[PDB]
Design a protein around this ligand. Structure first.
Ligand SMILES: Nc1nc2c(ncn2[C@@H]2O[C@H](COP(=O)(O)OP(=O)(O)OP(=O)(O)O)[C@@H](O)[C@H]2O)c(=O)[nH]1
Ligand SMILES: Nc1nc2c(ncn2[C@@H]2O[C@H](COP(=O)(O)OP(=O)(O)OP(=O)(O)O)[C@@H](O)[C@H]2O)c(=O)[nH]1
Ligand SMILES: Nc1nc2c(ncn2[C@@H]2O[C@H](COP(=O)(O)OP(=O)(O)O)[C@@H](O)[C@H]2O)c(=O)[nH]1
Ligand SMILES: Nc1nc2c(ncn2[C@@H]2O[C@H](COP(=O)(O)OP(=O)(O)O)[C@@H](O)[C@H]2O)c(=O)[nH]1
Ligand SMILES: [Mg+2]
Ligand SMILES: [Mg+2]
Lengths: 420, 429, 67, 420, 429
């Protein structure tokens, strides 16, 4: 009952999912052999517990990544559907030439693993937006499953490329190519940047050398938290669709923002307290959210807050009402009680309380504007275009793609000025 | 599942490849004896003990091949992968592209076909040829056409040595270089332009070596190429692919002439005094002095820079150092590329070669830049050609091997096309 | 390739926690790490200099022989 | 209940704040490990106490001033908002150019520490009016907070430029450019001058080596005594707003004088005896205060006397009436019974009675002339004016400010000798 | 997060800097060979054990740079910071500022750029030079120009050794010294006028030596500069940054020519027979007899005085003694600046250089005064200038090197205006 499939994509999403299964096996207490020490795992003959996830990519080298680190012993060797050539950091490459080959196999193995469930609530994906394999094969797979499974919902933990920190050079193209389709066939693009994560690591935790593993650990924490009121008892339980109703008010105002609390250093943990007041104050902080979009520079259409632990519901919901009534300017006014709380009777390991915060805000519009800018330059000069043409895709899409982007942010903007 | 083929035609590229295979065998632990006491990218297995390297050594003049056919490393290669002729090209084109090439390039094609069907996940070619000699020019063009029509899809990266600005070891350089530009544009998808006087000055001021020689330059080029193929060969916290090089660096099918740089090229003494951090190394990797093609980056305008690192590195260090770099005002980019800095990391520090003036050091950077300043280089060379063609100098030596005269003017306008493009793209909106 | 395999140097064992308490930030030994790294590089440079001196002296020996 | 926050800016303010937290810990009995051995401190996990203080400065060196000194482990690193350059005695740096880069963060952390309370009795600052960092940052912060919470009060234990013994050359510019605001958006701008502090330390205590630590000790003890009628019970209690009501007749004559008692050297301590008569006669003298304005050269619009210890309230009030009737000329007539009293029921640590005198007198006007006069002789030639002119100032911003200063002092005159 | 660049050009500048680095490397426990058995301002970590000083030594005559390379501190510096020319400066201007200095200016600017990126919390520069020389003025002027047009906000600290009234070591020194004012005003922020004759007399009377030498000269200058930078480097009750001077010593950015003074300068036996409290030391500080420049402030006024008391000194005594010294009649301030004495304190005493003639003292006071009397110096110098240019003396040695002669009078015009400007601020209003 109430299971979840977890598709992967691109080496980014693969590493993120590896660390997520790390944190999950940690919380449920499963050593890397699959012995106890249904929502996420499947029983296995002899008593093993094998996680339910499908790993797809095109550079088979990345295989040796997940097979290397601990908790890599988990995935069944039959789910490792890969290719030979590699992504090549191109969209049309991994979406029209190579994707069109292995996508059928991916669909068939997803069908094999899906009906093994009885009541499947939704999906969740892990990938970048510009990375060839990730972006391309992920948007294609989402197209297929959303034209196949309309009842369920398509959660998506897309790590957006924040153009402040640079890793590739033709990212904006593939970012737009993924956005145009994910707005069309995905209900929760819970975007995540790297700028804000490196910032949270530099100051909120005073970390000096944040390697990709650490940021992946923090995102794994957020991903485990986003669904804690589901597999655990609680005074007010939540699911993947209460999220879907309390949050998105429209077909296409469904792009999100993430946050987690409490994150503290060593030298700071001796001086503070651990109570719902301070957890809340730390939750709404701008420097405590994993989306490079200043919340104060916008509003919140709505937000959900899953607490884990045990505390009087009164202080929770009263402080919710209070933090709404104080900053009623940065909260939308044509929606009453735009916030929503939820409580779970069991926190994660180590801590006592834990705040997993999600927000459908009209500020992350900015996190797309920038991309648009890049496009509007690199498209009028038609730079780096001769690759995206002779491989299956033509220029046409690009044009209309950018169009939709405008409309998208445009809609957000109007509600920042819609007053009634 | 992935490997590279490397061809060394001519006398320049073959010396560069001698030093290059030297360094490679040194880093992978492969003793020169083949039998050793991550490498599938370069060396295959002949079923017993000794690892044979993937390469063909072509040269019509059998002198240098006889240097290696009986030198220190003859135990290594395959006695069929060392093809030698019985004469030279005498620095003219047609004799290495029309008459004598006709016999040898077919055998080269067969051997390369065999090496291709031997390997499974071949990802790219690496030709090694100066354009100064008639071999590296004519044979280069013919083999390049033969491969671009045989294999096709696979990328190509020619570490081609041009004639320097002012110094030369042949007086008919402008001729047998312009005729290879036509080949280099169409069939050679990319081109890592290398020169000599740049590396000369690098040796004369950085490594304190007062009387450098071709072997030092070749050792340094070997280090550069090892740094390039690091991500494929070795481990990596954040890797890059030899296909990813191309689309991250080829904005248009006719502006793909990329130059290179490497750091830290520092002798033993001066290494005793250096911050050694990522900041200063990726700072010195941008100064004009250590650009391995004698050009003036202070004048042109970069388009796209890829940076293969190696040695222990925290990615946030790269991000902050690149922030400082883009903060520097004197360096400027084109409008259509706001994100031009591609990075890539690997976790194998540089390797030391006994006798190499390079001081052992953990961190190391290697940059490859597609920029628009390189156009001036072409223009510079153009000047030479002018002051020859007016007098039909040395032309009969070419017509005496079946090459029509008008080819000179045609290749001249062909390179004027590049001098038009590379100063057309670097223009505002 | 084998991307994401070292995190120079990392990959601790099974042991861990589910929340966010320890992240191996600063490695709790970063300072000793830098000190030992610097000492190792100084040793390397000393050895390289000790070798280059002799390689040079060989040239003066050859010069005396030629004279 | 009735909490207070502690903003400290500039070197002088930060050092005095360190000494003041030392004295407060001495009184409430808290060793530097922040354990007992809610108005000021705040709780933290493990019964730890962290002071509700906030430290800011432009030069980071002062960190090794507040953390190094004893009792420096009470604070929290998250409350140290420290820049990197140092305003360098240039006011415009801490108010137009560098100010607006740290004011955002410091306002954020003030709001964090403010919302964490329930009854915010008011702010109280410790800074200087001569140094660029202190002056500029503190005045901009006061601006922002009185634009934020217009209902609470802002006390400032801000020192003034020394009348005679000058240590800086750009002093009058900074003094005037900060008074032009502190006249507008402050409530209790208690002023302290180094010259009178040396006068006390050389004539009332017969000391022989006064270091800045000792002046700060004195002013911090007086600071404690000012509000120590709130932390403790009282036969007739009081707090900040009682002072604010009984001490300012018109909304702009809010610059006070401060005095303490008792003070004795070795000999007199071995000879004299502490009784309410002697304390009163020692308090209402001229050189028992911290302002180089001889009170006989003016009158007291009003003056509060806070007593501490176990005394006889009849003796206190009778001697208040007696000292008002005796020196009747030195007081003002158009406010009958112009002297106010208040009594706490607990003395300081190691004493048996103590007195804190807070006098809103019309004698400080002389000061606001001399310093102002300095400006008049340093502005008629644009001396050092090009610095402030370069950072974005305008000459009007100077001139009117000066006039405002004039206006202020004239006000005293205009309603010092008035009656009906 | 604090650091300063110490550019040393010319000849006198480089020897003064040598003695200065002696004093610095001494007081920080650093060993002269670089290793070590509070320094981030001057010395930096070099990634291998030892530390290297933030400095660059430009010069054309290879003798002094060679003496540094073969002296005691050979291992201290970085073998790149020592930029040595190929010939001499010949005591003219155009041969260090118009024709030859253009060979070394660009290399110097690249080295300064490297030093700047290797640092984070920059605070200013410290250029030391003479002007009676050939390269100390010319190359110094060019460097000041390039820096002021390259960096901008960072304030420069010139330490210029002017010509003293009577003692002379050149006959053409007025010419090239005047040739430096055209660029000292524009590009330089603070200029500490230092002469020689005054310091010779200082060494004669106080230190009791009767055979003084340039080495003792430089020792004293190094002492003064170390006492200047103690506030950056060390503890202190009342610290004073290097951005305090601009706010405390520069009324109008066109009159910024300060002069130094130091105390106590006492030999060994002349401290035994004394008391040497703070009061007597701050009386001795103002005495024009032991001022470090040739000027008699009795014939001038004082705009501002920055005093830095290093060593065990309490502040109240400083305040009282300041009140007394300001109350004296023969030392009069200007009316438009009544509160003039800025004072700072550091809790570290002097650290005597081994082998020096000075004595260890628990206290020391270093005064830098912006005064109005120094103006007459300039006037005096013009006198000399005129008595040469009235007869076109030596103009050929400058016109021979492209120097448009029309600059000369211009300088003697521009500097002349300076005098008027001082006659504009001596106006008792
Ligand atoms: N940097 C570098 N340049 C080299 C090296 N070896 C040769 N060259 C250059 O090769 C160029 C001459 O072109 P080649 O193709 O070698 O001449 P060739 O092989 O005799 O040509 P033919 O005999 O006519 O077939 C010269 O400019 C050399 O500087 C080397 O080891 N390093
Ligand atoms: N205070 C001080 N002054 C010095 C020192 N050495 C030289 N000088 C001064 O240098 C001036 C001579 O001019 P130079 O600096 O030697 O000439 P230049 O510009 O360097 O040109 P060349 O020396 O010919 O290469 C004299 O006035 C000296 O007073 C020193 O060690 N200390
Ligand atoms: N926060 C985080 N971002 C990652 C990680 N790995 C990759 N990324 C991003 O992934 C982007 C490229 O996408 P990628 O998956 O490598 O392209 P692919 O060749 O199709 O697999 C890069 O811009 C990286 O920044 C990770 O471990 N953590
Ligand atoms: N009574 C007393 N006055 C001080 C102290 N420290 C500094 N002052 C004075 O305060 C003025 C400078 O204020 P400061 O805090 O340094 O601000 P800044 O100069 O902008 O950094 C100067 O006049 C100092 O003399 C102290 O500890 N006690
Ligand atoms: Mg040949
Ligand atoms: Mg010279």
């Amino acid at each position: 009952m109430r299971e979840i499939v977890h598709i992967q994509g691109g080496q980014c999403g693969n590493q993120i999912g590896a660390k997520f299964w790390e944190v999950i096996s940690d919380e449920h207490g499963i050593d890397p052999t699959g012995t106890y020490h249904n929502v996420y795992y499947n029983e296995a003959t002899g008593g093993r517990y094998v996680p339910r996830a499908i790993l797809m990519d095109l550079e088979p080298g990345t295989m040796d990544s997940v097979r290397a680190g601990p908790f890599g012993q988990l995935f069944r060797p039959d789910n490792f559907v890969f290719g030979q050539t590699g992504a090549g950091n191109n969209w049309a490459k991994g979406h029209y030439t190579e994707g069109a080959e292995l996508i059928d196999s991916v669909l068939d193995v997803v069908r094999k693993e899906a009906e093994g469930c009885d009541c499947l609530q939704g999906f969740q994906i892990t990938h970048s937006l510009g990375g060839g394999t990730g972006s391309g094969m992920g948007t294609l797979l989402i197209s297929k499953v959303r034209e196949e499974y309309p009842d369920r919902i398509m959660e998506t933990f897309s790590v957006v490329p924040s153009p402040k920190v640079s890793d590739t050079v033709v990212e904006p193209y593939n970012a737009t190519l993924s956005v145009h389709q994910l707005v069309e066939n995905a209900d929760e693009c819970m975007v995540i940047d790297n700028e804000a994560l490196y910032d949270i690591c530099f100051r909120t935790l005073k970390l000096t050398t944040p390697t990709y593993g650490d940021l992946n650990h923090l995102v794994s924490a957020a991903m485990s938290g986003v669904t804690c009121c589901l597999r655990f008892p609680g005074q007010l339980n939540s699911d993947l669709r209460k999220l879907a109703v309390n949050l998105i008010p429209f077909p296409r105002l469904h792009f999100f923002m993430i946050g987690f609390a409490p994150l503290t250093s060593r030298g700071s943990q001796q001086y503070r307290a651990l109570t719902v007041p301070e957890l809340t104050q730390q939750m709404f902080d701008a420097k405590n959210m994993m989306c490079a979009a200043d919340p104060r520079h916008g509003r919140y259409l709505t937000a959900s807050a899953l607490f884990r632990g045990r505390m009087s519901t009164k202080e929770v919901d009263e402080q919710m009402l209070n933090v709404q009534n104080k900053n009623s300017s940065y909260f939308v006014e044509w929606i009453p009680n735009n916030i929503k709380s939820s409580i779970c009777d069991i926190p994660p390991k180590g801590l006592k309380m834990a705040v997993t915060f999600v927000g459908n805000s009209t500020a992350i519009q900015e996190m797309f504007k920038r991309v648009a800018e890049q496009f509007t330059a690199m498209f009028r000069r038609k730079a780096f275009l001769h690759w995206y043409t002779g491989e299956g895709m033509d220029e046409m899409e690009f044009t209309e793609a950018e169009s939709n982007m405008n409309d998208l942010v445009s809609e957000y903007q109007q509600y920042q000025d819609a007053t009634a | 599942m992935r490997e590279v083929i490397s061809i060394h035609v001519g006398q320049g590229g073959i010396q560069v490849g001698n030093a290059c295979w030297e360094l490679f065998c040194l880093e992978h632990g492969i003793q020169p004896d083949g039998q050793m006491p991550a490498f599938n990218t370069f060396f295959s297995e002949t079923g017993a003990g000794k690892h044979v390297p993937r390469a063909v050594f072509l040269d019509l003049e059998p002198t240098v091949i006889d240097e290696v056919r009986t030198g220190t490393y003859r135990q290594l290669f395959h006695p069929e992968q060392l093809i030698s002729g019985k004469e030279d090209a005498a620095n003219n084109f047609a004799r290495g592209h029309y008459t004598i090439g006709k016999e040898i390039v077919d055998l080269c094609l067969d051997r390369i076909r065999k090496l291709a069907d031997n390997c499974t996940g071949l990802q790219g070619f690496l030709v090694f040829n100066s354009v100064g000699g008639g071999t590296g020019s004519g044979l280069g063009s013919l083999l390049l056409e033969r491969l671009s029509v045989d294999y096709g899809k696979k990328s190509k990266l020619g570490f081609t040595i041009y004639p320097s600005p002012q110094v030369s070891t042949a007086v008919v350089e402008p001729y047998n270089s312009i005729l290879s530009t036509h080949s280099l544009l169409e069939h050679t998808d990319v081109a890592v332009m290398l020169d000599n006087e740049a590396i000369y000055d690098i040796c004369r001021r950085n490594l304190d070596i007062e009387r450098p020689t071709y072997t030092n330059l070749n050792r340094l080029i070997a280090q550069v190429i090892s740094s390039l193929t690091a991500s494929l060969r070795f481990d990596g916290a954040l890797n890059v692919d030899i296909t990813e090089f191309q689309t991250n660096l080829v904005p248009y099918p006719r502006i793909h002439f990329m130059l290179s740089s490497y750091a830290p090229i520092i002798s033993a003494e001066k290494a005793y005094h250096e911050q050694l951090s990522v900041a200063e190394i990726t700072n010195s990797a941008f100064e004009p002095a250590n650009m391995m093609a004698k050009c003036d980056p202070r004048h042109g305008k970069y388009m796209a820079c890829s940076m293969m690192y190696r040695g222990d590195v925290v990615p946030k260090d790269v991000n902050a150092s690149i922030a400082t770099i883009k903060t520097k005002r004197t360096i400027q980019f084109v409008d259509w590329c706001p994100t031009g800095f591609k990075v890539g990391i690997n976790y194998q520090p540089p390797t030391v070669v006994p006798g190499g003036d390079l001081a052992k050091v953990m961190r190391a950077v290697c940059m490859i830049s597609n920029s628009t300043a390189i156009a001036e280089v072409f223009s510079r060379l153009d000047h030479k050609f002018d002051l020859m063609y007016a007098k039909r100098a040395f032309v009969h030596w070419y017509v005496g091997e079946g090459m029509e005269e008008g080819e000179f003017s045609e290749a001249r306008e062909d390179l004027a096309a590049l001098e038009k493009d590379y100063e057309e793209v670097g223009i505002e909106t | 390739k084998e991307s994401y395999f070292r995190e120079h140097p990392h990959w601790s064992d099974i042991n861990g926690c589910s929340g966010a308490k320890e992240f191996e930030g600063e490695d709790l030994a970063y300072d000793a790490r830098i000190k030992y790294q610097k000492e190792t590089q100084k040793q390397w440079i000393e050895q390289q200099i000790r070798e280059k001196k002799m390689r040079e002296e060989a040239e003066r020996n050859e010069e005396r022989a030629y004279a």
